[PDB]
Structure 1
């Protein structure tokens, strides 16, 4: 005789079918959350962090916008049981490099955090895809793969996905064309060591390198190499200006989530286990174009690289392995 019962005759006393979890509710985690919500990718969104008030506040702020969304359940908690049955778990938590801190010790601190996060995630969603966004993303994708025990197709790092998107943005600005119609790939290690593959840059299938052979070289009077320099530094420039980056990474991560959740088999440059390619013999993750879908990475595109490009990926792999073999799991 409650109001609910006077109004509603229940037929069914009835698990989520398209659930995504975001771990970490810093600026990056919440940018991923809002972008996923506005793209209607999930029927349930779970948020996890260790700061309880901030977590609850973010969950409530999203819930209050429910009228404008098509995601009918948003939940959160410090307890990983709220993440149960996720198709996709996006990891954005972890430690930032501090003053005086080595890359090795920063990574070790993140190993120690992932040793708590990842087994809890795996416990409640043993068949999920893990999408690692935390930096340094290539090494932390390896760390998540090692700790989770997942097959390599289900452990994906966001890698050079945004680097590539920035590259196409800058390309489009130079040419006066939408980035959607400007094509070009940044591969390898995310960050300062990434590799712009000049041979693949094109508009409508017309090779810029063929039209303009000095493209990307020191002799280039248009200094197109400065485009890749800008890609590397634009992250730093945004951090210097507003303190951090968030929006572009959130959009780029939602794009990856779309391909996975909707089984699109679109090709994205993400970090994946690259052993066996380009002379690399160690268990390291680097960005190459991957086909993304329901089972994670199902296929790799084998981009033809020059000797110099290949040597740069090899050099990155050697460094990554050099750090990885010193980690304590």
Structure 2
């Protein structure tokens, strides 16, 4: 009867994701599902022990796929490691579908873009109901670094990373800005004394994953938060512009591929999609980026 979210696989991401939910109050319900029943169950005990202090307390309980019949979102947090996740994914989607599930999919495990489309196959529901991290975290990583660079609130910083999530991302420097003044127009005062520091900031973003991963072993708080953000926009029908994994079909010259761009999100899922008036470099970059992703698909299917 109320906002329910089934979350598949309680790893570091699924956990952090789950704890963000606890603290922000986005859903009323959460059920944690894992093969590692041990690691899930214990999660549902620790989390529930903060309930009496949660400003927006969630009913957190564990279960198995029989409980996702009514679930309104399933979040998925479960080299050639690809097919492994695929055996895992198809090994895991088939279970939820039989349950009675008729909601909207949400996925976060790398390689997200691949695994999103991979998820679109096994499922068989309108392409407006499968989603993935896309470049939100990278947009948010880009915002953060641009807020620290320009010294204005991140939310007052507007700049997308777009494309797939990996070795081929790109900045939309064109319509990037701070409070409605374009990034370009900001540097215009000092010829390259910004410019290249901002191009370095591009690399800090592209690299930040590896960096964090080198420092504390993995990455999880960030995606947890972006996860939570996408969720909110969905449950509470926001019509919010996020850079999720959206199925294009003509947009940015590409078709037959889940990619990260500015997609509107609401109760349904992907609602509209913004085609951005890009440019050669970025268009080419996106086009090329749209490239590698098309490849990796065919055979593994």
Fold in common (TM above 0.5):
yes
Is 2:222 the partner of 1:248? yes
Distance 1:323 1:213, change over 3 A: farther
Aligned length: 300
> Which of residues 130, 139, 147 in structure 2 aligns to 1:164?
139
Partner of 2:280: 307
Note the C-alpha offset of 1:107: 1.6
Partner of 1:96: none
Note the C-alpha offset of 1:275: 2.6
Is 2:30 the partner of 1:55? no
Note the C-alpha offset of 1:170: 0.4
Note the C-alpha offset of 1:162: 0.5
Partner of 2:7: 22
Q: Distance in 2 between matches of 1:66 and 1:232?
A: 37
Aligned 8 A contact 2:26 2:231 in 1: yes
Question: Could you list the per-position Cα deviations for residues 120-145 of structure 1 after superposition, in whole angstroms to 9, with x for gaps in the alignment?
Answer: 22233532111110101111000000
TM-score normalised to structure 1 length: 0.86
Note the C-alpha offset of 1:192: 2.9
Is 2:293 the partner of 1:320? yes
Q: Distance in 1 between matches of 2:65 and 2:143?
A: 38
Partner of 1:275: 249
Aligned 8 A contact 1:86 1:125 in 2: no
Q: Distance in 2 between matches of 1:250 and 1:210?
A: 34
SS at 1:75 equivalent: strand
Note the C-alpha offset of 1:264: 0.7
Distance 1:148 1:261, change over 3 A: same
Is 2:211 the partner of 1:237? yes
Instruction: Extract structure 1 runs of 4+ deviating beyond 4 A.
Output: 217-221
Aligned 8 A contact 2:187 2:195 in 1: no
SS at 2:219 equivalent: coil
Partner of 1:76: 62
Partner of 2:77: 92
Question: Unaligned regions of 5+ residues in structure 1, if any?
Answer: 1-15, 94-101
Aligned 8 A contact 1:76 1:82 in 2: no
Q: Distance in 2 between matches of 1:128 and 1:218?
A: 50
Q: Which entry has the higher C-alpha Rg, 1 or 2?
A: 1
Alignment of 1:90-239 (within 5 A): 90-93=75-78, 102=79, 105-212=80-187, 222-239=196-213
Note the C-alpha offset of 1:211: 4.3
Q: Distance in 2 between matches of 1:309 and 1:46?
A: 41
> Which of residues 230, 253, 266 in structure 2 aligns to 1:293?
266
Q: Distance in 2 between matches of 1:112 and 1:71?
A: 36
SS at 1:200 equivalent: coil
Is 2:237 the partner of 1:263? yes
Question: Could you list the per-position Cα deviations for residues 93-120 of structure 1 after superposition, in whole angstroms to 9, with x for gaps in the alignment?
Answer: 1xxxxxxxx3xx3221111111121122
Q: Distance in 2 between matches of 1:89 and 1:76?
A: 14
Distance 1:122 1:71, change over 3 A: farther
Is 2:18 the partner of 1:33? yes
- CA RMSD in angstroms, aligned pairs only: 2.0
Q: Distance in 2 between matches of 1:256 and 1:72?
A: 18
TM-score normalised to structure 2 length: 0.94
Question: Could you list the per-position Cα deviations for residues 152-189 of structure 1 after superposition, in whole angstroms to 9, with x for gaps in the alignment?
Answer: 11001111000000101100111111111111110001
Question: Could you list the per-position Cα deviations for residues 184-212 of structure 1 after superposition, in whole angstroms to 9, with x for gaps in the alignment?
Answer: 11000112311100011111211121343
